[PDB]
Amino acid sequence: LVHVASVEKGRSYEDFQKVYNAIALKLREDDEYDNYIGYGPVLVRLAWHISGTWDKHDNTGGSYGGTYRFKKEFNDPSNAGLQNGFKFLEPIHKEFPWISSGDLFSLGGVTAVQEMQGPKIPWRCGRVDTPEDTTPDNGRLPDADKDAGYVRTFFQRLNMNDREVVALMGAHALGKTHLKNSGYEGGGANNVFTNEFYLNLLNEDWKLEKNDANNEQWDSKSGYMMLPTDYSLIQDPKYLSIVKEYANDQDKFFKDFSKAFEKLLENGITFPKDAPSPFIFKTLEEQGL
Numbered sequence: 234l235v236h237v238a239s240v241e242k243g244r245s246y247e248d249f250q251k252v253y254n255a256i257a258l259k260l261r262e263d264d265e266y267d268n269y270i271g272y273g274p275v276l277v278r279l280a281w282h283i284s285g286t287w288d289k290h291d292n293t294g295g296s297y298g299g300t301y302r303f304k305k306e307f308n309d310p311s312n313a314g315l316q317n318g319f320k321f322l323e324p325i326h327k328e329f330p331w332i333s334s335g336d337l338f339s340l341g342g343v344t345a346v347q348e349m350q351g352p353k354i355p356w357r358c359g360r361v362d363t364p365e366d367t368t369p370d371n372g373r374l375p376d377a378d379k380d381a382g383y384v385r386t387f388f389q390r391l392n393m394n395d396r397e398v399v400a401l402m403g404a405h406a407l408g409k410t411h412l413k414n415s416g417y418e419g420g421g422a423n424n425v426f427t428n429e430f431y432l433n434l435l436n437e438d439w440k441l442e443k444n445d446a447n448n449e450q451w452d453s454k455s456g457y458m459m460l461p462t463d464y465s466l467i468q469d470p471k472y473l474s475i476v477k478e479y480a481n482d483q484d485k486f487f488k489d490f491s492k493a494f495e496k497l498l499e500n501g502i503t504f505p506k507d508a509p510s511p512f513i514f515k516t517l518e519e520q521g522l
């Protein structure tokens with residue numbers, strides 16, 4: 234399939250900065266969500282899951298068509314919990330009805346990363362809502378009870394290499410698992426974007442335990458947890474080298490995450506040669522708002 238980005242009619246940077254601001258102000262306002270984590274991490278997870286359905290082989294799935302809005306995808310077991318992100322964005326969509334669904338879901342992720350003190354993520358508009366029959370079947374998102382070889386093969390479908398996979402996974406510094414969503418038990422959580430995922434992988438004393446859903450996960454006495462696929466990044470020697478790199482260089486992690494996350498959000502989209510350049514949105518803080 235070819236999906237050509239089409240700018241929402243007459244819109245420019247200032248329009249999208251307004252949408253960014255509305256999302257950011259609501260992120261600040263709705264601070265109580267999920268035991269005071271706020272909506273930042275679930276917005277990042279939503280932007281990833283609406284993108285992570287992409288298949289490079291036939292260009293099905295991906296963020297372009299906004300298909301998460303349709304019941305098949307909305308009800309994917311892999312997406313359990315994401316309804317909260319969708320509900321958060323609903324009033325934003327209603328205030329700015331001109332923005333496409335894929336643009337809104339992906340921008341929500343960019344906004345959340347930046348507002349949580351993450352790197353700037355350049356972002357491009359022009360995703361166009363596609364019909365219900367374009368919604369990808371369930372089962373394209375990854376399982377957590379797997380090893381490094383699984384992770385590496387899985388991400389080849391999204392055209393991501395080892396460095397991109399390790400960078401993207403640093404998002405698991407954010408938020409938590411919820412037993413009722415995924416069968417993984419979380420505890421403490423953070424809503425500030427840092428490279429701490431890599432530091433925790435290397436520095437904590439991990440114990441392989443069974444949780445209350447009878448699934449294995451790696452736990453530390455500090456109350457930290459890792460999925461088996463997280464832990465695989467220190468079991469595989471190629472992933473381990475990159476983990477160490479990011480643990481020792483915050484700026485390099487930020488730069489690599491920004492590139493990979495934009496790429497993830499743009500996979501499947503053809504941008505015309507005279508499309509606008511990617512937008513870099515100012516944070517609320519930078520605007521004095």
Ligand code: HEM
Pocket residue numbers: 274275277278281313314375376377378384401402404405407408409410411412414415416417460462494
């Ligand atoms: C091997 C690949 C991955 C697997 C198996 C995986 C699995 C999971 C699972 C099981 C959860 C818990 C969901 C819940 O119980 O609420 C989760 C949460 C999350 N994921 Fe991943 N994930 C992967 C990659 C990624 C990527 C690439 C990103 C973004 C760059 C990401 C961002 C997040 C975030 C921010 C959360 C927390 C959401 C919240 O706190 O509500 N994940 N992931």
